[PDB]
Amino acid sequence: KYYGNGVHCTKSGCSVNWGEAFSAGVHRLANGGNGFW
């Protein structure tokens, strides 16, 4: 499993949640302010 432990830190996030990675992918896009639309 990859819900904690075994994560394999990829030099850019450890825990690496897959649902939180879509929320982190989400916010990754929305880390500008007005450059999404």
C-alpha triplet 27, 31, 37: angle, nearest 5°: 85
15 vs 23: CA distance, rounded Å: 14
CA dihedral 31, 35, 25, 13 (to 10 degrees): -40
How buried is residue 17: exposed, middle or buried, by Cβ count under 10 Å (0-12/13-18/19+)? middle
Q: Are 30 and 36 in contact (CB under 8 A)?
A: yes
Total residue count of the chain as it appears in this document: 37
Question: Which structure tokens are listed for 27?
Answer: 């916010």
SS (H, E, C) 1-37: CCCCCCCCCCCCCCCCCCHHHHHHHHHHHCCCCCCCC
